[PDB]
Amino acid sequence: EMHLLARLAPHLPYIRRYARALTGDQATGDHYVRVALEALAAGELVLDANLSPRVALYRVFHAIWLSSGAGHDQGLHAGDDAAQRLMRIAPRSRQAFLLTALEGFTPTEAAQILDCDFGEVERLIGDAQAEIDAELATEVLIIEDEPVIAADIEALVRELGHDVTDIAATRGEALEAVTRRTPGLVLADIQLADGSSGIDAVKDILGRMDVPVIFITAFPERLLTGERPEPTFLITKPFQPETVKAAIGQALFFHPRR
Numbered sequence: 001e002m003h004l005l006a007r008l009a010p011h012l013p014y015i016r017r018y019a020r021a022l023t024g025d026q027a028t029g030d031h032y033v034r035v036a037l038e039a040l041a042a043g044e045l046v047l048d049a050n051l052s053p054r055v056a057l058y059r060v061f062h063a064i065w066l067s068s069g070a071g072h073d074q075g076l077h078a079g080d081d082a083a084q085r086l087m088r089i090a091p092r093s094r095q096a097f098l099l100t101a102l103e104g105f106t107p108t109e110a111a112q113i114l115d116c117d118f119g120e121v122e123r124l125i126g127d128a129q130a131e132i133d134a135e136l137a138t139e140v141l142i143i144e145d146e147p148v149i150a151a152d153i154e155a156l157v158r159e160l161g162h163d164v165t166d167i168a169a170t171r172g173e174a175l176e177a178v179t180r181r182t183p184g185l186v187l188a189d190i191q192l193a194d195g196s197s198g199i200d201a202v203k204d205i206l207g208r209m210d211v212p213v214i215f216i217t218a219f220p221e222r223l224l225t226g227e228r229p230e231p232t233f234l235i236t237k238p239f240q241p242e243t244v245k246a247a248i249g250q251a252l253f254f255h256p257r258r
Helices: 004-023 025-041 053-063 081-091 093-104 105-113 118-133 147-159 171-182 205-207 241-254
Strands: 137-142 163-168 185-189 213-217 233-237
Touching: 004 025, 004 053, 004 093, 004 241, 025 053, 053 105, 093 105, 093 118, 093 241, 105 118, 118 241, 137 147, 137 171, 147 163, 147 185, 147 241, 163 171, 185 241, 213 241, 233 241
Parallel strands: 137 163, 137 185, 185 213, 213 233
Antiparallel strands: none
C-alpha cells in the first residue's frame, strides 16, 4: 500500500551498483538510473502492476536503456550513439549474468527484466560465465585489515584462477607491495582500523597504470548515492561468492592487462 517513491527508494542504490558495473563508469551508471527514476516519478512510464517493485524497476531501466534491437516502451534505439556503445560493452549475455550473479535475481526474475524465456536466460548466463572464466589470470593486491575478511577474499580470488601477490593491512603495507610489483587488480577496504581508506597511498600510482580497483565495504549503500564521486566497482562483506566473481569479471573486462 506504499506510494510510488517508497516502493522504489530502497532499490535505487543497488540499481546504481548494477548500472555502474554494466557500463564501467560511475557517472554514466548513475545518470541512467536518475533518468529512469525521473521518468517513473513523472508518469512517463509505469511499473508493472504485478511484478515486485525491484523487478519492475529493473524492467523499466532495461526498456529505457537496453532494448535496442528489440505498445512496448522503448527509449534508446540501435542508431543512438549510447546504444551502439552498450551493444558492444553490455550485451544481453552480460546483463543476464550481472542480474543473477551481482544483483541476486533468480533466473526467472532476470527473464522478466530481459523480456525473454527461462531457456534464453540460462543460455545467456552460460555465455557470459564462459567469457568471464576465460579472463586471463592476473596479479591481485588485497588491502584489508580484518583478518577473516582478508582470508575470505584471498580464497575467492584464488578460486577464480588469479594470483594474490600480497595482502596489506595498512596504507603503508599497500605502498610497500605496489613498490615491489604493480598489480593488475586491487581489492581495497573503504575503511581500515585507523579510519583511513586503504587505497590512499597507492591511488596515484595505480591510476597512472589504469589498474582497476574494487572497493570492499559492509555498507555499500553509502557509496551508491549518485551525488558525489564514488566507486565504480563494489563488493559487500561478508562475501557472497558470485558477487565477487561478477565484480572482478567486470573490472577486468573494462581494464584488462592491468
